Design a protein around this ligand. Structure first.
Ligand SMILES: *[C@@H]1O[C@H](CO)[C@@H](O)[C@H](O)[C@H]1NC(C)=O
Ligand SMILES: *[C@@H]1O[C@H](CO)[C@@H](O)[C@H](O)[C@H]1NC(C)=O
Ligand SMILES: *[C@@H]1O[C@H](CO)[C@@H](O)[C@H](O)[C@H]1NC(C)=O
Ligand SMILES: *[C@@H]1O[C@H](CO)[C@@H](O)[C@H](O)[C@H]1NC(C)=O
Ligand SMILES: *[C@@H]1O[C@H](CO)[C@@H](O)[C@H](O)[C@H]1NC(C)=O
Ligand SMILES: *[C@@H]1O[C@H](CO)[C@@H](O)[C@H](O)[C@H]1NC(C)=O
Ligand SMILES: *[C@@H]1O[C@H](CO)[C@@H](O)[C@H](O)[C@H]1NC(C)=O
Ligand SMILES: *[C@@H]1O[C@H](CO)[C@@H](O)[C@H](O)[C@H]1NC(C)=O
Ligand SMILES: *[C@@H]1O[C@H](CO)[C@@H](O)[C@H](O)[C@H]1NC(C)=O
Ligand SMILES: *[C@@H]1O[C@H](CO)[C@@H](O)[C@H](O)[C@H]1NC(C)=O
Ligand SMILES: *[C@@H]1O[C@H](CO)[C@@H](O)[C@H](O)[C@H]1NC(C)=O
Ligand SMILES: *[C@@H]1O[C@H](CO)[C@@H](O)[C@H](O)[C@H]1NC(C)=O
Ligand SMILES: *[C@@H]1O[C@H](CO)[C@@H](O)[C@H](O)[C@H]1NC(C)=O
Ligand SMILES: *[C@@H]1O[C@H](CO)[C@@H](O)[C@H](O)[C@H]1NC(C)=O
Ligand SMILES: *[C@@H]1O[C@H](CO)[C@@H](O)[C@H](O)[C@H]1NC(C)=O
Lengths: 4, 523, 523, 523, 4, 4
């Protein structure tokens, strides 16, 4: 999951 | 009295073979000399047809030479390959580290650009959280620089883009220090958000390069945070592009009073290096419609700036993109006649519900935006290969053009040891660079630079700087001038030469035969 | 009746001075006018001789202009300056660390190249152990790359050289992703073992550079082992050479359907940098034997590929090397007519006993090989300065040639911080580069890359990559066309002009004097 | 008998319209034919005036072509951007660390340059201690390189500047090793204290580049001390200059037998990189005063070296500087006729008391020196823009000139791992570079290099080296030759063509009218 | 104070 | 002794  | 006037002209005429024909007593001699006269006339007609059509080819001629006339010093446009300011970027990163939800961060800053940026990103956060594993290539394209330059007011971006006082450490031209406020002119580019053009100002504080332009630029990214994990920061990257991820300065050397296009022209300089640009000026002069093709105006433009073929070609590409996809590419000039046309990357269509849900409608809108971008890029790549389309735009070369052949060169600017110590002192103790930011509006940047550029770590910190040297290597211009290859005077001369060589007639003899014809009339 | 026909022509002739001569009643007037007539005839003869010989100089003329016709996009050849694959090199190093005796290692690997490499090196191990202090310069030359490319089958080397899937991370042309299997063509070079040529494929998956060619290449050597001591690894180095020890990519931009020669042409790009190649196309047209020299075929070749002067010159050097030293240089094209000639670096003569002893016979063979190499190099350096030898090879310039003036530029590709994070993700999460090697045949390379390119060390690891951008900077070609300076038509015109200016004769007057001569015949 | 001779010429003349005029029986016909005759004569006069003046424009013509004639290999001048030797610099730094008072250090060394340097610096130490906060920009200029090159004997500086044996690690030309003593020629430059010119020596020890020039140069500054604080070291830095702080090699490629000017021409190479210079030779031939401007001699020079426009321009700038400021710029050639003129940076005026006191007299002398420098720099920057002044110096382009278009390229020379291990061994075990300094006069440098370049730290140490490759990329020269556009022969031909086309007269007819005039005389 |  |  690439978070912001 | 046909015979009458005939023999008159015969005996007094200046034309060569006709006489012998007219006075030939022998029958076989009359045959021979009629044959010769008509054969010579026929060959004269052949060669005249040849030469007349050669002139009608409106041919062209060219000359090349070195001349001592000096050209005006070129305009130098400098763009930092990083679009946003370092403090702004660190603020964005730290806000996302404190809370990764963009919706919550819209009210956590008074900076206009930050509020706009968070508002725009919030419209895509649920979609990104739900579908990034299925459509990574989509979100990587939506979150590119050009999208933000297409959806946020440039006057708002300009407050967060790289500033002149934080970009040009020092500047020198013709043995004098530059006045940055008067010599640098800011302009906006969709990829290089802020760019600056240096316009030369001749001497009316003596120091610096005596024979050219030299400046020290802050271009590295070493003071940005180094995260433990990959995190998505929209608006910084440009997915699958030639000038992506790069660090340094983009330099465009172009004639004065011309619009630069850093995304497809210019030279690159990495941080930590000193670049020398040896300018070899070239000038080309061209001739008009009949003898060739050239223009002194842009068919698509308002005529305010000097004409460059690039402007016409780019506006033609924009014309075709608008015609085909129904939208304009943000990476190309906006056609002056069509200010009402939306950019292809516009996203005002997105409902507010997309900030709270990942519904199919939001997804379909996302994919429609993606498809618009695909249409525009496809046309951009295809149309240049379509000679019919390009010829329909009437993009002829400039009638008077100055070109610059640039010799590139690199060296490591801050040398290790004492030399580099002197460089560091020049920047931080004499120019006192980091005190520019000791203001109410830039205190955080001041603290960042104070902690980063301290004395104990100069060998590493100084590698974020770059130096440019632009100078005219050759004092003499290489001129290249077109001209008409076959003048009307040369035509007249060669037709007369052929006329004398084949039949011996001169224009006075032409008046003579005209007199004979008028005599036949009088008879 | 000589006088008869004489006075006839006199009174009716169109020629200028002869009349007055023939009808001159006064004796002094006859003298004056004969003098004038013959003087004018003499000067006419002088100028005619001058002009006739000028035409016989078969002179030459040239024109230069910019034209809108587009050239085909150039073929781009990329060579990794490192010849062998990283996993293969680490395997060799670790085998020599486990046991430094090459003879023992011939059976320790199933890889064909490794077995051949160990077999070849074993023939020199005792000599190296016994004589390296006395003849270091000899062994440093024997153990060079070219020796191995000259003694091992290229089809065996190709299994250990750099592979396409491990070299080109990403590729884009004209707004579309490249199909590496269809667009890249592999070829073998004695120094750059594996090289690949990109042949453009126009649009029939839209992404990437819209107006050119861009690719990301793995070119660094950071993942190789770093030994505590200097150890000899034959076949990697090339002693005392211009392109030795270098790290990066060798780029050759050349017209399509032409053989590249990376060892003496092309441009270099270091790892960790992004290179921009601004292509300025140039075209030259040349004229044939009488008016000049040009060829459309290689005198030494089979005629399959387009002609470049380099091919003729290199094959001529090979011809002279074979003639003098009795062997062919591996660094030059093999003459098609002489496939039976051995390379100068061949070592099939070495007995098996040299794998077990350092006898004088093995030493003498070593020195004879060294002497062969010296002969070839001496001829290579000398022959270019020998204009007689070069002229004997009939290497005339191409009659139609496309040339590329390339503007070089560098920037630091993976920027520090968030931009570089996006670059790293693009490579390793979207393209998923390191999963290419998750196969039975490349498991070790997969593990190496997994341990090396991990997230925590991207700032250092990414500096092994390089990016190339090749684009056509100017849409208009600089044409340069030869032509004949003095046509037959211009000759005729100027001879007629001289004839009229000096004696007034026209070709009809030539028929007139022919009539007089025939009249003298009839008399 | 005016009428008499008139009608005689009339009936026997070869001129076209005059006859009909003279024999016109009809009055209206006489009017018509007089009108025609005079009209044709007038138009002939018009066109003759045009063509005669075009010839008097002494016009010019140019041709361009590729030719197989080889040019002599260029002279290559290499300058280390660091002026002083590393051991000397470390000695200076350590002396100032032991005792910061320069006056005390005049007797602490037997090295001549050190004694002179300390003596010179001592004259400014009290002023620096007392006024550096008030006039930093003054002391930064006084303590520049050029001041020391202007006040210390070059023969004394040469003992402390970079030495050839410590600069050129290896050299190769045309497949053979260079003899450094015979091929390199030392010369002094005010900024690059020691510079060396390579003059090619063709083959009469075979190794190295076969088709050009290649060398490995020590250019980095990594072995200098890294102080904890910024310390002032005069004579190393050059305040506010384009080539300041830089690390690398300055390369000038110029024709043989010409003086180089590294401060305003040449290319730069950073340490740790391998630079490839693709030389594309160009030749220009020019014509003399009437048809153009060119010179084969320097108006200011002694005529010993080949003429380059740069020499004339620089000596002209020196002339004007001497005329205006009463002193000569050390950064420009010394005018041969004016050896008595002092440099602008001379400081022999300073009393000894300035070594002990900071009195106003010493301060005023300091500011006067500063003002002299300002005057010289102002004139340097202004005068080039003053076309009157430049034209007064008669600096015409060379009549026969060879120019080199250089294609630049960079790669990382010592590759990581085994390749770099081979490079390191080649330098330090075969060439045995650090043993050059195992002498009584260089023991300290030997120890420094031994501790620095040891095996365990080669990956970092080797980045102080740079490699240059200079080779001729194209065997064929691009010639560019001027010529006269309108010859006397072409003039005669075209005047004759016009004469025949408008009035029909030939030079024999000119003799005819001369006969008529002489007949009128006889009458 | 920049010392020497 | 440079070993292999
Ligand atoms: C030069 O800069 C000074 C200081 O910012 C400013 O006051 C002055 O107006 C500038 N000169 C111009 C803009 O011509
Ligand atoms: C000039 O442009 C027209 C099209 O506008 C083209 O037909 C013609 O061939 C061109 N001529 C030259 C000399 O470029
Ligand atoms: C070229 O452009 C014209 C006009 O846009 C279009 O009609 C034609 O189909 C295009 N051809 C190609 C091959 O793109
Ligand atoms: C920054 O400004 C404050 C006053 O607002 C001043 O006290 C401080 O000394 C300044 N910083 C420096 C480094 O001088
Ligand atoms: C100087 O800055 C570096 C970062 O560039 C930092 O690591 C170091 O601790 C700083 N030193 C001091 C004394 O603040
Ligand atoms: C393109 O690549 C795909 C996947 O490797 C392959 O199946 C296809 O044949 C290629 N297209 C060609 C070779 O024309
Ligand atoms: C053409 O080549 C021949 C040798 O093959 C040479 O003698 C002649 O001078 C050359 N002429 C030109 C114009 O290059
Ligand atoms: C030049 O080459 C010819 C033919 O190979 C040879 O006869 C002659 O001796 C050579 N001359 C030199 C100086 O190498
Ligand atoms: C490599 O392949 C194996 C199956 O052979 C698979 O289990 C593994 O997940 C793959 N590696 C990665 C990183 O997906
Ligand atoms: C990542 O790779 C580097 C070498 O490039 C290595 O030193 C480091 O230990 C690795 N980190 C992890 C977590 O594997
Ligand atoms: C070449 O170098 C050697 C060794 O320094 C020297 O003895 C010889 O004189 C040199 N050759 C020359 C200077 O021609
Ligand atoms: C040659 O130089 C003179 C001045 O010395 C100048 O007046 C003239 O115009 C120049 N002519 C050309 C063709 O350069
Ligand atoms: C140009 O130079 C001349 C001679 O040195 C001088 O008389 C004149 O004033 C100068 N003009 C300018 C604008 O510098
Ligand atoms: C340096 O010279 C001395 C003799 O003066 C010698 O003993 C020593 O071995 C030399 N250094 C090296 C590395 O050989
Ligand atoms: C090798 O030199 C480096 C400096 O370049 C030094 O730090 C290191 O201690 C040296 N190693 C040895 C074994 O002397």
């Amino acid at each position: 999951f690439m978070r912001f | 009295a046909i015979r009458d006037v005939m023999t008159k002209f015969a005996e007094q005429t200046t034309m060569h073979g006709v006489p012998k024909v007219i006075n030939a007593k022998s029958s076989m001699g009359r045959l021979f000399w009629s044959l010769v006269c008509l054969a010579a006339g026929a060959m004269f007609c052949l060669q005249m047809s040849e030469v007349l059509q050669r002139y009608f080819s409106y041919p062209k001629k060219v000359t090349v030479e070195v001349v001592p006339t000096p050209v005006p010093f070129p305009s130098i446009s400098i763009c930092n390959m990083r679009n946003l300011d370092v403090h702004i970027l660190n603020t964005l990163n730290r806000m996302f580290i404190e809370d990764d939800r963009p919706f919550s961060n819209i009210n956590k800053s008074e900076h206009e650009f930050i509020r706009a940026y968070m508002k725009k990103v919030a419209k895509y956060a649920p979609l990104f959280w739900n579908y990034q594993d299925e459509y990574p290539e989509v979100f990587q394209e939506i979150f590119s620089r050009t999208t933000f330059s297409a959806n946020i007011d440039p006057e708002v971006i300009a407050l967060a883009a790289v500033q002149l006082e934080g970009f040009v450490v020092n500047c020198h031209y013709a043995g004098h220090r530059c006045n940055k406020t008067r010599d640098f002119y800011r302009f906006f580019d969709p990829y290089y958000f802020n760019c600056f053009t240096y316009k030369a100002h001749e001497p009316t504080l003596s120091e610096g390069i005596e024979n050219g332009w030299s400046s020290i630029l802050l271009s590295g990214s070493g003071m940005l945070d180094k995260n433990d994990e990959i995190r998505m920061l929209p608006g910084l990257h440009e997915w699958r592009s030639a000038v992506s991820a790069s660090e340094g300065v983009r330099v465009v050397i172009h004639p004065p009073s011309t619009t630069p296009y850093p995304f497809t022209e210019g030279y690159d300089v990495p941080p930590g290096f000193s670049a020398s640009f040896g300018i070899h000026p070239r000038r080309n002069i061209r001739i008009g419609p009949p003898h060739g093709n050239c223009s002194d105006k842009n068919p698509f433009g308002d005529g305010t700036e000097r004409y460059r073929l690039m402007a016409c070609q780019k506006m033609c590409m924009q014309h075709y993109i608008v015609e085909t996809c129904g939208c304009a590419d943000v990476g190309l000039p906006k056609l002056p006649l069509q200010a009402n046309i939306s950019w292809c990357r516009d996203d005002d269509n997105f409902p507010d519900e997309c900030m709270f849900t990942a519904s199919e409608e939001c997804l379909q809108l996302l994919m429609q935006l993606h498809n618009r971008i695909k249409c525009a890029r496809s046309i951009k790549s295809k149309i240049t290969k379509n000679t019919t389309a390009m010829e329909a735009c009437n993009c002829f070369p400039p009638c008077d053009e100055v070109s610059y052949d640039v010799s590139y060169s690199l060296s490591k600017w801050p040398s290790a040891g004492y030399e580099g110590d002197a460089a560091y002192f020049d920047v931080f103790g004499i120019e006192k660079f980091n005190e520019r930011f000791n203001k109410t509006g830039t205190q955080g940047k001041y603290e960042l630079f104070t902690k980063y550029f301290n004395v104990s770590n100069r060998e590493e910190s100084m590698k974020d700087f770059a130096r440019l040297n632009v100078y005219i290597a050759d004092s003499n211009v290489v001129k290249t001038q077109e001209s008409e290859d076959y003048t009307r005077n040369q035509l007249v001369s060669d037709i007369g030469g052929q006329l004398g060589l084949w039949v011996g007639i001169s224009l006075i003899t032409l008046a003579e035969v005209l007199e004979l014809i008028i005599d036949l009339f009088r008879l």
